[PDB]
C-alpha cells in the first residue's frame, strides 16, 4: 500500500485546471484505473507511476497546473506550443523529481520563479517564446545538475548575470532575442567548462569579448552576433579546441582577424561580417578546412590567401564590401562544392578561376565592382546549377561562351559595364528561368536572336550602350511579361509593328539613339502600364498617334525624329515642351514648336 | 538596406495573388535588382512600378524612407485603407499615381510638402474629406485628377489649382467652388 499512487486523480485535476477546446485530453477517462495508457502519459516504472507527461501542441489554455507536482515520479514535463498563461508558480519546486521542463511557446508572463533552482534533478529548462520579464533570479547560479538553460525570445530587461557562469554542469546557455539592459559578456562565463553552446544573439551585449571565453575547450557554437560589442576578436579564441561555428556578425568589432583561429581544427563556419575589422585575412585560418567564410562589409585589405581553395568542404565565401586586392585562388571551386561566391565591391584583379563550378553546385556568382579581366571561363557554360550571375562593373572582354547564354536555372544575367564582344547565341532560348537580362554598356554586336522571344518569363531586357543592330525580332513582341525594354544607344534599325500591342505589362520602352525608321504604331496607346516612353534620337516619321493621349505618361521624348503634323491637343502643354524638339514637320501651341 | 527593409514591410502588408513581389528578397543588400523597383546610379530607389498587379491590402508609413523616390505607381489595384501621411516625406517625388484603387479616408495635408510633384492622380478611389489647400503650394504640379471620389468642401482656385479644369474634380460627393456648379456657403 506504501507503493500505491493517486496519479490518475492528479492528472484528472490537471485536465480540469486547463481549457481543452480541441478535446486533446479525451483519452483521459476518469473510469480508467491507470493513467499509463492515456495520451501524452508515460509510466516507465514497475508500478503505475507517471514518469513523463507531454501535452505539446494540444491548444491547452490556463495557468500552470501545480497539482501535477503531486506526481511523485514525474521526471519529464512538456507543455510546448500551448496557451499556458499567468505567472509561473513558485510552488513548481514541489516537482522535485523533474529532469526536463519544456514550457516553451506558451503565454507565461512575469518574473522567473527563483524556486526553479530548488528543483535538484532539473537537467533541461526551456522557457523560450514566453513573456517572462525582469532580472534572471540569483537562485539560477545554484542549479545543481542543469545542462540546458533556454530563456530565448522572452522579455527579460535585466543585465546578463555573471552568476550564470557558476553552473558547471551547463552545456547550453541560450539567452538570445531578449531585451536585456546593455550588458558586458561576464568574464565568469569562461568558467562554464562543459559548455558546448553560447547563444547570445540580440542580447544588447556591449563591451569587449572577454579573453576568458578562450578557456571553453568543449564549445561547439559561439553566437555573439547582432550585438554592439567593441574591441578586437580575442586571440585567446584559438583555445576553443572543439568549436565548429563562430558568429560575431553585425557588431562594432575592430582590429585584425587573429591568426590563432587557425589553431581551431574543428571550425567550419565563421561570420564576422558587418564589423570594422581591418588588416589581411590570415593564411592560417584559410588553411582550416572551412565550410562557410563570411567576412563581408569590413575594412579588410590584402590578398585572399590561396589556402582557402584547399578546403574540401567550402560551399560559401562572402567577402564583399572590403578593400581586398590581387587574384582569386587559381584552384578555387576545384576541390570544394562551391555554391555561393560573393567577392563584390573589392579591388580583385586578373582572370576568374577556371573551375569554380567543378563540383557542379555553384548557384550564385557575384563579382560586381572589381577589376577582373579576360574571358568567361568556358567551364561555366556547363554550370547549370547557376541561378544568379552578376559579373557587372569589371574589365572582362571577349565573346560570352555559347552555353552560358542558355543556362536553365539562371534568373539574373548581369554582364553590364564590361567590354564583352560578339552576339547573343540562339542558346538563349534554353534560359527557361531568365527573368532579368542586363547587358548594358558592352561592345556586343549583331541582331537580337529570334529565340529571345521563347523566354516568355523575361521581365527585363536592358542592352543600352552596345553595337547591337538590325530589325527587332518579331518574337520580341510575344514577351507579355516584359516590364522594361531599354535598347537605347545601339544601331537598331527597321520599323515598330502592331505586335507592340502584346507588351501589355511594359512600363518602360527606351529605343532612343537608334536608327529606327517608320511610323509610331497606333497600338502604342494599347500598352496599359506604359508610364515611360523614349523614342528620341531616331528617324521615326508620320503623325504622332492619337492613342498616345489615352496613356498617362510620366516621361515622354519623341524629340530628334522625322515626325510631322500637329500635336494631339492633350500633348500641347508646357510639360511636353522638350518632348517634341528636333521634329521639323511638327507644330503645336508650344513656345519653341514652329 | 533601409530602402529594401521599407519595401519588404510594404510587401508583408500587401496581398499578392500573382506573386509580382517574389523578386523582393530582403537578404539582398539593395532592392535595385528587385523587379518593379528601379534605382539611380547611387543605388537609391527612384521608381516603384506596381500598377495593374491585382494587389490588395494596405500601404505602410515606411514608404516615406525612400527619399530619392521620383515615381510611385500603385494604380489599377484593390489597395485599401488610408494614404499614409509619411508619403509627404518623399521630397523628390514627381508622380503619385494611386488611382483606380479602393483607398479611403482623407488626402493627407503632408502631400503639400511634395515640392517637385508634377503628377497627382488619386482618381477612381473612395477618398473622403476636403482637398488640402497645401496642394496649391506645389508650384511644379501639372496633372491633377481627384475625380470619381467621395471628397467634399471647397476646391482651391489659387497656385497650381489656378490652371486646373473641372474634369480634375468631377463626380465627388459635395465639392463647392468656382470649378464646380455649386458655389460655396
Amino acid at each position: 500500500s506504501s507503493m500505491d499512487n493517486q496519479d490518475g486523480f492528479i492528472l484528472q485535476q490537471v485536465k480540469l485546471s486547463l481549457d481543452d477546446p480541441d478535446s486533446y485530453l479525451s483519452s483521459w477517462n476518469s473510469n480508467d484505473a491507470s493513467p499509463c495508457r492515456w495520451s501524452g502519459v508515460s509510466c516507465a516504472g514497475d508500478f503505475s507511476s507517471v514518469t513523463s507527461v507531454d501535452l505539446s501542441s494540444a491548444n491547452l489554455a490556463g495557468p500552470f497546473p501545480s497539482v501535477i507536482c503531486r506526481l511523485s515520479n514525474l521526471a519529464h514535463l512538456s507543455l510546448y506550443n500551448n496557451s499556458i498563461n499567468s505567472t509561473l508558480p513558485l510552488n513548481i519546486a514541489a516537482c522535485k523529481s523533474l529532469q526536463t521542463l519544456d514550457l516553451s511557446q506558451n503565454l507565461l508572463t512575469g518574473e522567473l520563479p527563483q524556486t526553479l533552482a530548488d528543483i535538484p534533478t532539473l537537467v533541461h529548462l526551456d522557457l523560450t517564446g514566453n513573456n517572462f520579464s525582469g532580472d534572471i533570479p540569483a537562485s539560477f547560479g545554484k542549479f545543481e545538475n542543469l545542462e540546458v538553460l533556454s530563456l530565448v525570445y522572452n522579455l527579460l530587461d535585466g543585465t546578463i548575470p555573471p552568476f550564470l557562469g557558476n553552473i558547471s554542469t551547463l552545456k547550453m546557455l541560450n539567452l538570445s532575442y531578449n531585451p536585456f539592459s546593455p550588458s558586458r559578456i561576464p568574464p565568469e562565463f569562461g568558467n562554464l567548462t562543459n559548455l558546448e553552446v553560447m547563444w547570445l544573439t540580440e542580447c544588447h551585449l556591449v563591451g569587449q569579448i572577454p579573453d576568458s571565453l578562450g578557456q571553453l575547450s568543449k564549445l561547439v557554437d559561439l553566437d555573439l552576433a547582432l550585438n554592439d560589442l567593441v574591441g578586437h576578436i580575442p586571440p585567446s579564441l584559438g583555445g576553443l579546441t572543439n568549436v565548429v561555428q563562430i558568429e560575431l556578425y553585425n557588431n562594432s568589432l575592430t582590429g585584425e582577424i587573429p591568426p590563432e583561429l587557425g589553431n581551431l581544427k574543428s571550425l567550419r563556419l565563421l561570420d564576422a561580417s558587418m564589423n570594422q575589422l581591418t588588416g589581411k585575412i590570415p593564411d592560417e585560418l584559410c588553411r582550416v578546412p572551412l565550410e562557410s567564410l563570411n567576412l563581408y562589409e569590413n575594412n579588410l585589405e590584402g590578398e585572399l590567401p590561396a589556402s582557402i581553395a584547399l578546403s574540401p568542404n567550402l560551399y560559401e565565401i562572402r567577402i564583399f564590401g572590403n578593400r581586398l586586392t590581387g587574384g582569386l585562388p587559381k584552384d578555387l571551386g576545384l576541390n570544394s562544392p562551391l555554391r555561393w561566391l560573393d567577392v563584390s565591391e573589392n579591388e580583385f584583379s586578373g582572370d576568374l578561376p577556371a573551375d569554380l563550378c567543378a563540383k557542379g553546385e555553384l548557384e550564385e556568382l557575384l563579382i560586381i565592382h572589381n577589376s577582373f579581366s579576360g574571358v568567361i571561363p568556358e567551364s561555366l557554360a556547363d554550370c547549370r546549377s547557376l541561378t544568379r550571375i552578376r559579373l557587372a562593373y569589371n574589365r572582362f572582354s571577349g565573346s560570352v561562351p555559347t552555353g552560358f547564354w542558355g543556362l536553365p536555372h539562371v534568373n539574373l544575367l548581369e554582364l553590364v559595364n564590361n567590354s564583352f564582344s560578339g552576339e547573343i547565341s540562339k542558346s538563349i532560348g534554353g534560359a527557361s528561368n531568365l527573368s532579368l537580362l542586363i547587358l548594358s554598356n558592352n561592345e556586343f554586336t549583331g541582331s537580337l536572336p529570334e529565340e529571345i522571344g521563347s523566354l516568355d518569363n523575361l521581365n527585363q531586357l536592358s542592352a543600352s550602350g552596345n553595337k547591337f543592330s538590325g530589325s527587332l525580332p518579331d518574337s520580341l513582341m510575344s514577351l507579355g511579361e516584359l516590364g522594361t525594354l531599354d535598347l537605347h544607344g545601339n544601331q537598331f534599325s527597321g520599323e515598330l509593328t502592331s505586335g507592340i500591342k502584346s507588351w501589355k505589362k511594359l512600363n518602360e520602352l527606351n529605343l532612343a539613339d537608334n536608327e529606327f525608321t517608320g511610323k509610331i504604331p497606333d497600338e502604342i496607346g494599347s500598352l496599359s502600364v506604359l508610364n515611360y516612353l523614349d523614342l528620341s534620337g531616331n528617324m521615326f516619321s508620320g503623325k504622332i498617334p492619337v492613342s498616345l493621349q489615352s496613356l498617362k505618361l510620366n516621361q515622354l521624348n519623341l524629340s530628334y525624329n522625322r515626325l510631322s503634323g500637329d500635336l494631339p491637343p492633350s500633348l500641347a502643354k508646357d510639360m511636353y515642351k522638350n518632348s517634341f524638339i528636333g521634329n521639323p514637320g511638327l507644330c503645336g501651341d508650344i513656345k519653341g514648336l514652329c | 538596406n533601409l530602402e529594401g527593409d521599407a519595401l519588404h514591410t510594404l510587401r508583408v502588408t500587401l496581398v499578392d495573388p500573382n506573386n509580382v513581389l517574389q523578386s523582393w528578397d530582403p537578404t539582398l543588400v539593395n532592392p535595385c535588382t528587385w523587379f518593379h523597383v528601379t534605382c539611380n546610379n547611387e543605388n537609391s530607389v527612384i521608381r516603384v512600378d506596381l500598377g495593374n498587379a491585382e494587389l490588395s491590402g494596405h500601404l505602410v508609413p515606411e514608404l516615406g524612407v525612400l527619399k530619392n523616390l521620383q515615381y510611385l505607381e500603385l494604380y489599377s489595384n484593390n489597395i485599401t485603407g488610408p494614404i499614409p501621411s509619411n508619403l509627404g516625406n518623399l521630397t523628390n517625388l514627381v508622380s503619385l499615381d494611386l488611382y483606380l484603387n479602393s483607398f479611403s479616408g482623407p488626402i493627407p495635408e503632408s502631400l503639400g510638402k511634395l515640392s517637385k510633384l508634377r503628377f497627382l492622380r488619386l482618381n477612381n478611389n473612395s477618398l473622403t474629406g476636403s482637398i488640402p489647400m497645401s496642394l496649391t503650394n506645389i508650384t511644379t504640379l501639372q496633372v491633377l485628377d481627384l475625380s470619381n471620389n467621395r471628397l467634399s468642401g471647397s476646391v482651391p482656385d489659387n497656385g497650381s489649382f489656378s490652371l486646373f479644369t473641372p474634369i480634375s474634380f468631377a463626380n465627388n460627393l459635395d465639392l463647392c467652388g468656382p470649378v464646380t456648379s455649386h458655389p460655396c456657403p
Binding site: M274, R318, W340, D342 | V29
Partner: peptide
C-alpha cells in the same frame, strides 16, 4: 528576427 544560430546570408 528569431533566426537559429548560424551565418548571415546577405548577398548582392
Amino acid at each position: 528576427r528569431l533566426v537559429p544560430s548560424g551565418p548571415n546570408p546577405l548577398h548582392n
